[PDB]
């Protein structure tokens, strides 16, 4: 057992310091080892260039395959696959366009969604896709 003496504050303080460092959450937070762990490098969003549309080039009319695109992140040059929210938003997006990408799928994947894709397209030319779809804004060139 541990010491339960009246004059043992220094011994008790040393035990609690050691217990803190064994917590993996405490070490990671104080040393800053995982600040840049996420694919966005610590940011919540990222900007990318639309490479080409894998779903449309294949002729499968699944509508879950059709809304997959390939983009290249500007910050680190990685190539990822993202979802377009709806078929017909593909018409607003052209190749070599600049888009804003957010995360997707932490909660999970719905029925009819392709597993292993963890990104979605939110804006093109700094305009939200829903506003373009609803006819509230026009895409500047």
């Amino acid at each position: 057992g541990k010491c339960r003496g009246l004059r043992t504050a220094r011994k008790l303080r040393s035990h609690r310091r050691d217990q803190k460092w064994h917590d993996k959450q405490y070490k990671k937070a104080h040393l800053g080892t995982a600040l840049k762990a996420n694919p966005f490098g610590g940011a919540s969003h990222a900007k990318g260039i639309v490479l080409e549309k894998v779903g449309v080039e294949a002729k499968q009319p699944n509508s879950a395959i059709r809304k997959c695109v390939r983009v290249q992140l500007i910050k680190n040059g990685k190539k990822i696959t993202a979802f377009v929210p709806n078929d017909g938003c593909l018409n607003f997006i052209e190749e070599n366009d600049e888009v804003l990408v957010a995360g997707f799928g932490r909660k999970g994947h719905a029925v009819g969604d392709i597993p292993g894709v963890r990104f979605k397209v939110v804006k093109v030319a700094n305009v939200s896709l829903l506003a373009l779809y609803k006819g509230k804004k026009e895409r500047p060139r």
Binding site: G108, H109, A110, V111, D113, P115
Partner: peptide
């Protein structure tokens, strides 16, 4: 008929996630 359908919809919701669907299919196998 509508009452019977609504009971199945709750079971459909009770596994509507992708990992849940693959969960039983290994278990039924």
């Amino acid at each position: 008929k509508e009452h019977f359908r609504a009971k199945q919809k709750e079971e459909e919701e009770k596994l509507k996630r992708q990992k849940d669907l693959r969960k039983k299919l290994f278990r039924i196998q």
